[PDB]
């Protein structure tokens, strides 16, 4: 059958607090299997399903390290969006990222995802071809241009077509 | 294993 893996990373900036609230949730098909929350006392990726209990502490460690870097990515990129949209630095804003892979019955990639939404609205999205981007407005046009120039599609495609698919199969065997 | 580190916006 057709399976999918999806990650949703969201960061919400608040008034006064220099660190935005950052969350990340993973899904294998319909089921949420992993979650990281920055509000927690000891922020880390914790399993949300019994079949994820069979991953070593090394898995949870690097995954949490990555999450820590993602927070920093969001922190900086929320600020650049303020500049793009000419918004006040004393407000509340949200940036959401979603990426993942849909695999066929033959375990091969069908559709890869890499997309961002700012303040609930569209920002930029990698197309089905995994070669081009759809920018929502003029601000997202600045990102498209630099990502076209930097080869961002090729970069994301490498992950989506390999490691994403391979890990999905791994999790399916676990479940 | 998560996505590699994303490019600047």
């Amino acid at each position, epitope marked *: 059958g057709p399976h999918s893996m999806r990650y949703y990373e969201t960061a919400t900036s608040r008034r006064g607090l*220099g660190e935005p609230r950052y969350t990340s949730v993973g899904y294998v098909d319909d089921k949420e299997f992993v979650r990281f929350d920055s509000d927690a006392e000891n922020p880390r990726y914790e399993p949300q399903v019994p079949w994820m209990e069979q991953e070593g502490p090394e898995y949870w460690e690097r995954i949490t*390290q*990555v999450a820590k*870097g993602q927070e*920093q*990515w969001f*922190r*900086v*990129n929320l*600020r*650049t969006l303020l500049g793009y949209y000419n918004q006040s630095a004393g407000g509340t804003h949200t940036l959401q990222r979603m990426y993942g892979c849909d695999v066929g019955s033959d375990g091969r990639l069908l559709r890869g995802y890499e997309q961002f939404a700012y303040d609930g609205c569209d920002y930029i999205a990698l197309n089905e071809d995994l070669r081009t981007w759809t920018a929502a407005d003029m601000a997202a046009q600045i990102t498209r241009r*630099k990502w076209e120039q*930097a*080869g*961002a599609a*090729e*970069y994301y*495609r*490498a*992950y989506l*077509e*390999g*490691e994403c698919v391979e890990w999905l199969h791994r999790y399916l065997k676990n479940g | *294993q998560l996505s*590699p*580190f*994303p*490019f*600047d916006l």
Partner: T-cell receptor, first 111, second 110 residues
Framework: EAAVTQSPRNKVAVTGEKVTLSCNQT?????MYWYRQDTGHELRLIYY???????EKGDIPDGYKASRPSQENFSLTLESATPSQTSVYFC?????????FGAGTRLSVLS | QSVTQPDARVTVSEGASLQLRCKYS??????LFWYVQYPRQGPQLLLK??????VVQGVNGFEAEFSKSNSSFHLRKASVHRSDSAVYFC??????????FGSGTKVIVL
């Protein structure tokens, strides 16, 4: 490329001296990195930064301090210079994937 | 994670072709780069590989070939000039997009 520039270009320090290396980039890249290369061989990561206010220990952070006060500036401080810290220091900026390097800073710490 | 450049030094005649070896060992997705470094200068990008065509064209007559099976990213130039004498570094992208460099290969063109 004159987009990433370092200061000073050359420095001779005495053991125990506090030394600060400065890096300016005009690329508007969020990420900045400090490497050192001892014998024209492997560059090793000392410190890096995700953006203003961010400072992260690299592979070999012992003996250094870093400071990212703004987007364009990333400084590296040797608090108490030791002879083992003589080498060529390289700063880089990146928006992801490709790093862009400065021309280097030659630092000699006297034995 | 790591890249290995098996030949530390290469000597070739002016006008000969050049072939520099690089091997990587990286569980994750391999983002590969070749840089050149001339005396008193920093590393300069030659080319990179992310995905797609395994043969990539680069600056100043260089090209490279990615091979997943052999875990290699060999660099090539058909007709080297004296000005190509330098140190060549293979690199792989890691955490926070910091590059991890190979030990380098010094090229001498007689």
């Amino acid at each position: 490329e004159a987009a990433v520039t370092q200061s000073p270009r050359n420095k001779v320090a005495v053991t125990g001296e506090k030394v600060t290396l400065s890096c300016n980039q005009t690329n508007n890249h969020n990420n900045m990195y400090w490497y050192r290369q001892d014998t024209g061989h492997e560059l090793r990561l000392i410190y890096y930064s995700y953006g203003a206010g961010s400072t992260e220990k690299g592979d070999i952070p012992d003996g250094y301090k870093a400071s990212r006060p703004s987007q364009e500036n990333f400084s590296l401080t040797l608090e108490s210079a030791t002879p083992s810290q003589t080498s060529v220091y390289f700063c880089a900026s990146g928006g992801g994937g490709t790093l862009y390097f400065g021309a280097g800073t030659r630092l000699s710490v006297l034995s | 994670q790591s890249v290995t450049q098996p030949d530390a030094r290469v000597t070739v005649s002016e006008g000969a072709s050049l072939q520099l070896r690089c091997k990587y060992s990286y569980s994750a997705t391999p983002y590969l780069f070749w840089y050149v470094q001339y005396p008193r200068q920093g590393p300069q990008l030659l080319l990179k590989y992310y995905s797609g065509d395994p043969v990539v064209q680069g600056v100043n007559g260089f090209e490279a070939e990615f091979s997943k099976s052999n875990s290699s990213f060999h660099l090539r130039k058909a007709s080297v000039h004296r000005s190509d004498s330098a140190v060549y570094f293979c690199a792989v992208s890691g955490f926070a997009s910091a590059l991890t460099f190979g030990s380098g290969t010094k090229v001498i063109v007689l």
